[PDB]
Structure formats: structure tokens, C-alpha cells
Design an enzyme around this catalytic site. Structure first.
Site, mmCIF file in Angstrom:
data_model
loop_
_atom_site.group_PDB
_atom_site.id
_atom_site.type_symbol
_atom_site.label_atom_id
_atom_site.label_comp_id
_atom_site.label_asym_id
_atom_site.label_seq_id
_atom_site.Cartn_x
_atom_site.Cartn_y
_atom_site.Cartn_z
ATOM 1 N N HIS A 203 5.313 1.896 9.603
ATOM 2 C CA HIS A 203 5.505 0.654 8.877
ATOM 3 C C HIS A 203 6.978 0.498 8.497
ATOM 4 O O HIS A 203 7.735 1.468 8.498
ATOM 5 C CB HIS A 203 4.668 0.651 7.594
ATOM 6 C CG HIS A 203 3.191 0.644 7.820
ATOM 7 N ND1 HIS A 203 2.296 0.686 6.768
ATOM 8 C CD2 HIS A 203 2.451 0.601 8.952
ATOM 9 C CE1 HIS A 203 1.067 0.661 7.250
ATOM 10 N NE2 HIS A 203 1.135 0.581 8.565
ATOM 11 N N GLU B 132 8.709 3.995 7.762
ATOM 12 C CA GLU B 132 7.965 5.100 7.174
ATOM 13 C C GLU B 132 6.772 5.446 8.066
ATOM 14 O O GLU B 132 6.188 4.586 8.712
ATOM 15 C CB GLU B 132 7.593 4.831 5.693
ATOM 16 C CG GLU B 132 6.795 3.554 5.405
ATOM 17 C CD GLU B 132 5.289 3.749 5.272
ATOM 18 O OE1 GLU B 132 4.754 4.793 5.660
ATOM 19 O OE2 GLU B 132 4.644 2.803 4.735
ATOM 20 N N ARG C 220 4.690 10.555 3.289
ATOM 21 C CA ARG C 220 5.447 9.832 4.306
ATOM 22 C C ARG C 220 6.856 10.404 4.473
ATOM 23 O O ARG C 220 7.469 10.879 3.515
ATOM 24 C CB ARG C 220 5.643 8.362 3.906
ATOM 25 C CG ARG C 220 4.369 7.560 3.660
ATOM 26 C CD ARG C 220 3.570 7.314 4.934
ATOM 27 N NE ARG C 220 2.441 6.429 4.684
ATOM 28 C CZ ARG C 220 1.237 6.834 4.298
ATOM 29 N NH1 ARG C 220 0.943 8.117 4.226
ATOM 30 N NH2 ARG C 220 0.312 5.927 3.992
ATOM 31 N N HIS D 217 2.412 8.512 -2.048
ATOM 32 C CA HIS D 217 1.581 7.765 -2.963
ATOM 33 C C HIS D 217 1.073 8.606 -4.135
ATOM 34 O O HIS D 217 0.674 8.059 -5.163
ATOM 35 C CB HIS D 217 0.380 7.146 -2.237
ATOM 36 C CG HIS D 217 0.719 5.993 -1.348
ATOM 37 N ND1 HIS D 217 1.382 4.874 -1.805
ATOM 38 C CD2 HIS D 217 0.409 5.740 -0.055
ATOM 39 C CE1 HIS D 217 1.478 3.995 -0.820
ATOM 40 N NE2 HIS D 217 0.879 4.485 0.247
HETATM 41 N N1 LIG Z 1 8.899 0.880 -1.227
HETATM 42 C C1 LIG Z 1 7.633 0.714 -0.867
HETATM 43 N N2 LIG Z 1 6.629 1.106 -1.666
HETATM 44 C C2 LIG Z 1 5.324 1.010 -1.322
HETATM 45 N N3 LIG Z 1 4.890 0.450 -0.203
HETATM 46 C C3 LIG Z 1 5.848 -0.032 0.604
HETATM 47 C C4 LIG Z 1 7.265 0.102 0.367
HETATM 48 N N4 LIG Z 1 7.961 -0.476 1.362
HETATM 49 C C5 LIG Z 1 7.029 -0.961 2.192
HETATM 50 N N5 LIG Z 1 5.771 -0.700 1.766
HETATM 51 C C6 LIG Z 1 4.574 -1.164 2.513
HETATM 52 O O1 LIG Z 1 3.524 -1.431 1.592
HETATM 53 C C7 LIG Z 1 2.382 -0.623 1.915
HETATM 54 C C8 LIG Z 1 1.728 -0.206 0.636
HETATM 55 O O2 LIG Z 1 0.969 -1.236 0.056
HETATM 56 C C9 LIG Z 1 2.935 0.507 2.768
HETATM 57 O O3 LIG Z 1 1.981 1.025 3.689
HETATM 58 P P1 LIG Z 1 1.339 2.507 3.515
HETATM 59 O O4 LIG Z 1 0.989 2.664 2.054
HETATM 60 O O5 LIG Z 1 2.311 3.491 4.033
HETATM 61 O O6 LIG Z 1 0.093 2.418 4.366
HETATM 62 C C10 LIG Z 1 4.067 -0.166 3.513
HETATM 63 O O7 LIG Z 1 3.587 -0.843 4.675
#
Ligand SMILES: Nc1ncnc2c1ncn2[C@@H]1O[C@H](CO)[C@@H](OP(=O)(O)O)[C@H]1O
Ligand SMILES: [Ca+2]
Length: 114
Positions: free
Chosen positions: A41, A62, A85, A101
Site C-alpha cells: 500500500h 508499506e 509493516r 498497528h
Molecule cells: N500513516 C498511516 N497510518 C495508517 N494507515 C495508513 C498510513 N498511511 C497510509 N495508510 C493506509 O491506511 C490503511 C489503514 O487504514 C493502511 O493499510 P494497512 O493497515 O496496512 O492494511 C494503508 O493503506
């Protein structure tokens, strides 16, 4: 910057090899046109998360950080990406940070691995 010797993502400690394997996996999967569960992503800076990067300019991506990697998933065999990640510079692969997370301040937020 150099991949660190280790990083602690909310209790899951990973090696430099785990991190490298994750980035290499992301790059290969994009090249193969087979992005597992649609990873990588894009990663965006969201300063409330207190995540420093060591790679220089974006864009940033990521990808899941897992043991015995790289992370892979398919329609016929779904595998969770888990909480952890690697962040890398999309255009080059160069390492930026590891995040998780686990223990993040908000739903779907990231916090820095230590
Ligand atoms: N700084 C950040 N923090 C959290 N999510 C981010 C981010 N930048 C991009 N994302 C995006 O938001 C999703 C979480 O709802 C992430 O996917 P994942 O949680 O990795 O599945 C990213 O696509
Ligand atoms: Ca920090």
C-alpha cells in the site's frame, strides 16, 4: 538508511533479514503483477503517529513484515498481513522505517517499531 539489525514491533522483534525479505517481496510482487492481498500500500506521513523515516523523499510504500517471509496471500489461500509493516521508498526500495498497528493510538493507526 541502513536496515537496522533489529526492530521491536509491539513485542514482535524482527531482524534485518526479515525487513529485507519484506521489501524484496514487495518489489517482486509488484514486478510479477501479483500483489498479495493488494499489498504493498501507499504510506503517508501522519505526524500524529510520531513516525520518523530515515530514507528521504517519498513516495513511500508499506508492506507486511512477517517471520519466515516474504508475506504472501492469494485468492485460494488468504493469509493475514498481521500488524507489522516495513516502510520503503517506492521508487528505489530503500528502507525508511518499521511500523505497527499494535499499540497504535487510534483505530487503523500506525506507531513506530522501536
Ligand atoms: N500513516 C498511516 N497510518 C495508517 N494507515 C495508513 C498510513 N498511511 C497510509 N495508510 C493506509 O491506511 C490503511 C489503514 O487504514 C493502511 O493499510 P494497512 O493497515 O496496512 O492494511 C494503508 O493503506
Ligand atoms: Ca518516533
Amino acid at each position: 538508511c541502513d536496515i537496522p539489525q533489529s526492530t521491536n514491533c509491539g513485542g514482535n522483534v524482527y531482524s534485518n533479514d526479515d525487513i529485507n525479505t519484506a521489501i524484496q517481496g514487495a518489489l517482486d510482487d509488484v514486478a510479477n503483477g501479483d500483489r498479495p492481498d493488494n499489498y504493498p500500500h501507499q504510506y503517508y506521513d501522519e505526524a500524529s503517529e510520531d513516525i520518523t523515516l530515515c530514507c528521504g523523499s517519498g513516495p513511500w510504500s508499506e508492506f507486511p513484515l512477517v517471520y519466515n517471509g516474504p508475506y504472501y496471500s492469494s485468492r485460494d489461500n488468504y493469509v493475514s498481513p498481521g500488524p507489522d509493516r516495513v516502510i520503503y521508498q517506492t521508487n528505489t526500495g530503500e528502507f525508511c522505517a518499521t511500523v505497527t498497528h499494535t499499540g497504535a493510538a487510534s483505530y487503523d493507526g500506525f506507531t513506530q517499531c522501536s
